[PDB]
Each structure stands twice: as structure tokens, then as C-alpha cells.
Enzyme design. Structure first.
Site, PDB file in Angstrom:
ATOM      1  N   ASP A  29       0.794  -1.469   0.051  1.00 33.32           N
ATOM      2  CA  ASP A  29       0.481  -0.064  -0.042  1.00 33.32           C
ATOM      3  C   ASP A  29       1.019   0.899  -0.227  1.00 33.32           C
ATOM      4  OD1 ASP A  29      -2.835  -0.934   0.148  1.00 33.32           O
ATOM      5  OD2 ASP A  29      -3.429   0.174   2.183  1.00 33.32           O
ATOM      6  N   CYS A  69      -2.567   0.893 -13.374  1.00 29.31           N
ATOM      7  CA  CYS A  69      -2.445   0.827 -11.924  1.00 29.31           C
ATOM      8  C   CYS A  69      -3.664   1.872 -11.805  1.00 29.31           C
ATOM      9  CB  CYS A  69      -1.164   1.490 -11.504  1.00 29.31           C
ATOM     10  SG  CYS A  69      -0.254   2.507 -12.567  1.00 29.31           S
ATOM     11  N   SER A  70      -3.597   2.390 -10.060  1.00 30.78           N
ATOM     12  CA  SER A  70      -5.160   3.368 -10.421  1.00 30.78           C
ATOM     13  C   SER A  70      -4.867   4.708 -11.585  1.00 30.78           C
ATOM     14  CB  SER A  70      -4.644   3.825  -9.058  1.00 30.78           C
ATOM     15  OG  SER A  70      -5.851   5.106  -8.366  1.00 30.78           O
ATOM     16  N   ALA A  71      -3.168   5.324 -11.464  1.00 29.10           N
ATOM     17  CA  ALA A  71      -3.325   6.757 -12.638  1.00 29.10           C
ATOM     18  C   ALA A  71      -2.632   6.257 -13.700  1.00 29.10           C
ATOM     19  CB  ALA A  71      -2.610   7.638 -11.784  1.00 29.10           C
ATOM     20  N   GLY A  72      -1.904   4.977 -13.821  1.00 36.58           N
ATOM     21  CA  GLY A  72      -1.450   4.681 -15.363  1.00 36.58           C
ATOM     22  C   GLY A  72      -0.121   5.220 -15.587  1.00 36.58           C
ATOM     23  N   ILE A  73       0.267   5.669 -14.203  1.00 38.33           N
ATOM     24  CA  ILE A  73       1.435   6.293 -14.781  1.00 38.33           C
ATOM     25  C   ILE A  73       3.248   5.732 -13.596  1.00 38.33           C
ATOM     26  CG2 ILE A  73       0.865   9.128 -15.790  1.00 38.33           C
ATOM     27  CD1 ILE A  73       1.073  10.000 -12.779  1.00 38.33           C
ATOM     28  N   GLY A  74       2.203   5.313 -12.227  1.00 38.47           N
ATOM     29  CA  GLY A  74       3.766   4.874 -11.555  1.00 38.47           C
ATOM     30  C   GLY A  74       3.778   3.657 -11.571  1.00 38.47           C
ATOM     31  N   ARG A  75       3.062   2.727 -10.490  1.00 39.36           N
ATOM     32  CA  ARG A  75       4.102   1.221 -11.013  1.00 39.36           C
ATOM     33  C   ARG A  75       3.740   0.425 -12.806  1.00 39.36           C
ATOM     34  NH1 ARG A  75      -0.515  -1.004  -5.802  1.00 39.36           N
ATOM     35  NH2 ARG A  75       0.223   1.211  -5.398  1.00 39.36           N
ATOM     36  N   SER A  76       2.702   1.247 -13.616  1.00 42.12           N
ATOM     37  CA  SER A  76       2.497   1.186 -14.950  1.00 42.12           C
ATOM     38  C   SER A  76       3.894   1.182 -15.735  1.00 42.12           C
ATOM     39  CB  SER A  76       1.713   1.742 -15.557  1.00 42.12           C
ATOM     40  OG  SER A  76       0.488   0.947 -15.146  1.00 42.12           O
ATOM     41  N   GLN A 104       6.989   7.721 -10.344  1.00 47.18           N
ATOM     42  CA  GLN A 104       6.024   9.846  -9.788  1.00 47.18           C
ATOM     43  C   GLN A 104       6.440   9.425  -8.637  1.00 47.18           C
ATOM     44  OE1 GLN A 104       1.900   6.858  -8.616  1.00 47.18           O
ATOM     45  NE2 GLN A 104       1.088   9.074  -9.451  1.00 47.18           N
TER      46      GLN A 104
END
Ligand SMILES: O=C(N[C@H]1[C@H](O)[C@@H]2O[C@H]1c1ccccc12)C1CCC1
EC number: 3.1.3.48
Length: 283
Positions: free
Chosen positions: A181, A215-222, A262
Site C-alpha cells: 500500500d 494501475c490506479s493513475a496509469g503512470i507510477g507502477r505502470s 511518480q
């Protein structure tokens, strides 16, 4: 500089935040006018994360062709990816329309539906074989065929049917279920094992449309997923693998979607993943 020793030099000097801020300063800025039209407000999860106009995926629909999704086309590596936000209640039908129209084989999900006690994306696939989903706004049917639950990730086989033409296709859902998390994983080993499973399935290969990753925003983990994959492929293709510059690859990818990676912790984790992954490949 090489990667592994540039890495130790940033650790010993504790300058990850400064390196990451340099990337933010040099990153491309292109218009995102379509994303900001008033009619598209309920199609965006976050007001500060938008696709650029020049690289956005267009839905094949004359009313409103907008989805929060971007085509990342890596020319030297010969790989393409679609990076998108986690679907919203009013965009789950658009999401599957995109998968269909772009001829994708695989969907890569890097978040849980609930994290930190809040919803991070819609429940957009069926959880039981006998309870299929129908998306009436785009005329698609989606059925769960099988599910394989492992310790760090789950793989699902799904059937997507275009109800207009009665054509069907098999989609693979790769769900990384153990990203914490807060922060990043302590070791990249399970993330790399997951990347290799996606590769082995064919979902990243040129005989299919681009993989869809979110992912949630599509920029960090993605961003971490496609950055690690592209850097490892370049290290295999080139005569001199130590010439691969992860910061330069990241800036190239940021020409196609804003904000990839991010935090400075995600940047350090991406270095770690490429470094460890390059040892397992060999040889
Ligand atoms: O062709 C499809 N659906 C059709 C619907 O009947 C309707 O006409 C088409 C359509 C497209 C977008 C919205 C609404 C509609 C699916 C193949 C992926 C999308």
C-alpha cells in the site's frame, strides 16, 4: 556511466531526489486539450493525469472517442504498450472496447481494487464462471474461463465477445496482487518473475496488438513495468549492454505519457529491477 555503479554512487551520496527532480524538469510538455473538455470530466480519475493529444488512444466511436489511455511506441526496442488509468464505473465499457479495437492479447493490472481503504478502480472483470458481464453501452460480453492464484500474482483466462458480430477472442489477465500500500517492494524478484510470465504468454509480442497496462493513475507502477521491460530488451539487442541509459529511456517514454515514475523510490526500484534482471537473463 554504467548502471550498477551509478546506482551505488547515488545511494552513497543520497541524491535520488535530485536525480528524479532533474527528470521532472527535462520531461516533455505536450497539449492534452481533448482530455480537458468538459464533456470528458467523468472519464478522468485524476485531474492532473491526462493523455497527450498526439499519442492518445481513440475509441472507434463518432459520439465521443475519448479514453484516458496512451500509446507508448519504443522504436529501437520494437515494443509498444498502452498505458491507462484503472477503469471508472462509467468507463468499464470503454476499456473493453479499447482492448477489442486495438487487438490486445493481454491486460496487466498492478493494483488491488481497494487499497488504503479506498477504491482504486472498478471491479471490471467477472469473479465467477457462471456470472458473466455484459457492457451494454459498447455491446460486449466478458466471461471468466479459468483462474490460477499464486502467492504474488493471479492469471485469468477471459473470453471477450463482440455481440454485434459474434466474434470471440481469448484475453489473458495478469494481476500483480502484492505491491505494498505504501512505498515499493523490498526486492524486485517477484516483480521480475511476474514480468517474465507476461513475456512467456505472448502478450508482449508483435503478432498481437499492444499489451494494456494499468494501475490506479496509469503512470507510477505502470511506468516501472514498461521501463524495466524495455531496458532489459535493449541490453539483449545491443553489442554493448552497458550503454543502456535508464534515465534516457524514461525521458523517451515520457514523450508519450506524462508523469511516468511518480517518486524517487520508484526510480530507485526501477534501477534495482533492471540490474538484477540483467544477471538472470544470462547468460
Ligand atoms: O462494435 C462494438 N460495439 C458496437 C455497438 O453495437 C455500438 O456500435 C458499436 C459501437 C462502438 C462503440 C459504442 C457503441 C457501439 C464493439 C467492438 C469493440 C466495440
Amino acid at each position: 556511466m554504467e548502471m550498477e555503479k551509478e546506482f551505488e554512487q547515488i545511494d552513497k551520496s543520497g541524491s535520488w531526489a535530485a536525480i528524479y527532480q532533474d527528470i521532472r524538469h527535462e520531461a516533455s510538455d505536450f497539449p492534452s486539450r481533448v482530455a480537458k473538455l468538459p464533456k470528458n470530466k467523468n472519464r478522468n480519475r485524476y485531474r492532473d493525469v491526462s493523455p497527450f493529444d498526439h499519442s492518445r488512444i481513440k475509441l472507434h466511436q463518432e459520439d465521443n472517442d475519448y479514453i484516458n489511455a496512451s500509446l507508448i511506441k519504443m522504436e529501437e526496442a520494437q515494443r509498444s504498450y498502452i498505458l491507462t488509468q484503472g477503469p471508472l464505473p462509467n468507463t468499464v465499457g470503454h476499456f473493453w472496447e479499447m482492448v477489442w479495437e486495438q487487438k490486445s492479447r493481454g491486460v496487466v493490472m498492478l493494483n488491488r481494487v481497494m487499497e488504503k481503504g479506498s477504491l482504486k478502480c472498478a471491479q471490471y472483470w467477472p469473479q465467477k464462471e457462471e456470472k458473466e458481464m455484459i457492457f451494454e453501452d459498447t455491446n460486449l460480453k466478458l466471461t471468466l474461463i479459468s483462474e490460477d492464484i499464486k502467492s504474488y500474482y493471479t492469471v485469468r483466462q477471459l473470453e471477450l465477445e463482440n455481440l454485434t458480430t459474434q466474434e470471440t477472442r481469448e484475453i489473458l489477465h495478469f494481476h500483480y496482487t502484492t505491491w505494498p500500500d505504501f512505498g515499493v517492494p523490498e526486492s524486485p524478484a517477484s516483480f521480475l518473475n511476474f514480468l517474465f510470465k507476461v513475456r512467456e504468454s505472448g502478450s508482449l509480442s508483435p503478432e498481437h496488438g499492444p499489451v494494456v497496462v494499468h494501475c490506479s493513475a496509469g503512470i507510477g507502477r505502470s511506468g516501472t513495468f514498461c521501463l524495466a521491460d524495455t531496458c532489459l530488451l535493449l541490453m539483449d539487442k545491443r553489442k554493448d549492454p552497458s550503454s543502456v541509459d535508464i534515465k534516457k529511456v524514461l525521458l523517451e517514454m515520457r514523450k508519450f505519457r506524462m508523469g511516468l515514475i511518480q517518486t524517487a523510490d520508484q526510480l530507485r526500484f526501477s534501477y534495482l529491477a533492471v540490474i538484477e534482471g540483467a544477471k538472470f537473463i544470462m547468460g
